[PDB]
A = this chain, B = another copy of it.
Amino acid sequence: VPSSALSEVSLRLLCHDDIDTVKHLCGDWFPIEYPDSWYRDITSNKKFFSLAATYRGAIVGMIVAEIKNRTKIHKEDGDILASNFSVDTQVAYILSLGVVKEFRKHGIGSLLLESLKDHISTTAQDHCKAIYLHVLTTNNTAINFYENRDFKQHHYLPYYYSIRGVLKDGFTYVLYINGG
């Protein structure tokens, strides 16, 4: 992969034709398998903001975000917005950010993140006061990435057990924007 790969990278919305490719990439990047309907959802342009980075026609990275009002923020993360912000105030939750391994450290991840931030800072309907996400405590690469881009650790989420399943521990990271 050429050092100049970034200059020839394009950005576009995901579409239904991408589903198989997305599944494959997500299967490579994340141990948690979401149901098939999630993949349709993010490739539909209705409920999610999903941007792909492409190189010579191939998807080499992607970011998936959900724009939420305060009532759709994870309950354990309700306090990412101070208590004086209106319920209609919105935030962007990063469901997914990934780049094909060989294409990493070329600025693609930063590009996808910047694009999400511009999207929610310039258009009225998706205007947001924060970006937040969850990261496993063991994902040092992602933690450094976000902290170097001025996301702050907002919470530690402890390990959780139930007959319904197990949630690993993790962090809630948050970036305040546009007066957030």
Contacts and interface: CB of A to CB of B under 8 A. Distances in A.
A13 interface: no
Interface string A136-180: 100000000000000000000100111111111110000000000
A94 to B, nearest CB: 10
Instruction: State the oligomeric state as a number of copies.
Output: 2
A49 B167 CA distance: 25
Contacts of A30: 163
Contact of A32 (B34, B75, B136, B162): B162
A170 B164 contact: yes
Interface residues of A, number: 21
Contacts of A165: 32, 160, 165-168
A134 B38 CA distance: 26
A122 to B, nearest CB: 28
